[PDB]
Amino acid sequence: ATAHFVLVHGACHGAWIWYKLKPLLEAAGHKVTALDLAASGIDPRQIEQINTFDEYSEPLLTFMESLPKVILVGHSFGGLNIALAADKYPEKISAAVFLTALMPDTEHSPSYVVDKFMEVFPDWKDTEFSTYTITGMLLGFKFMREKLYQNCPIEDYELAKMLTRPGSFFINDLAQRPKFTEEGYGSIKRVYVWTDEDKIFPPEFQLWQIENYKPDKVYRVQGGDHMPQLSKTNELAEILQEVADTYA
Numbered sequence: 001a002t003a004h005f006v007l008v009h010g011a012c013h014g015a016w017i018w019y020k021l022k023p024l025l026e027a028a029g030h031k032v033t034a035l036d037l038a039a040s041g042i043d044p045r046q047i048e049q050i051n052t053f054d055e056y057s058e059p060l061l062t063f064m065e066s067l068p069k070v071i072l073v074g075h076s077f078g079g080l081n082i083a084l085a086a087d088k089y090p091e092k093i094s095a096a097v098f099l100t101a102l103m104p105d106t107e108h109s110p111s112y113v114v115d116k117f118m119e120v121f122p123d124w125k126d127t128e129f130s131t132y133t134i135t136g137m138l139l140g141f142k143f144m145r146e147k148l149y150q151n152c153p154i155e156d157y158e159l160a161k162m163l164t165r166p167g168s169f170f171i172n173d174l175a176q177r178p179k180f181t182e183e184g185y186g187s188i189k190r191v192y193v194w195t196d197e198d199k200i201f202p203p204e205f206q207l208w209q210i211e212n213y214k215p216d217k218v219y220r221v222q223g224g225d226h227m228p229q230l231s232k233t234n235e236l237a238e239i240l241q242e243v244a245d246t247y248a
């Protein structure tokens, strides 16, 4: 069965992270949309211009409204963006796939799993942080090479160095905004795809998020780093096909 997948990147990244997965899924007859969020990819805005998590999410929210059902795939921090889109348009979503992602729940503030990630005490190495009138971050080259892309082909790490941009977790926004609702986000089917060699979201942290808000299905990507759409593209495509077969 074929589906329309909507691929959503995390902080500091863009649509380009899907450059190998997208044509592979299209070769199986799926429709694929790979978005740049605000101030991401080649979007013209700068991160200092994005004042709220809603503004950051705008390209996904606009796309969801303009839909003529889709399977959302949120990577890393993109899990928060697809949770927000699901809270708004649950009827348009066949399933939400959380790919080594921050999966929020409905019982706690949206900031909950980001705070729990901070509790992991991640080693940011050469990442640079700053503030604007929100904390922003520019991921370090060594940080990305060792903590995110270490099982990726060298050329994918080269794309990351040429294309990653300043980003933000909008932690204060997430902490003060309303909890995601049981009627919206809480109503949709969820899939978590975890990687067992992830060096920034430890597998134990991915498993904690799974236990904290049990999804309908769970897949392990053996040998995946944090970037399985780059390091494990074929394996990921097979998992997404099964997800389309299950929920379409």
Ligand code: NA
Binding pocket: 014, 015, 016, 035, 036, 041, 042
């Ligand atoms: Na783009």
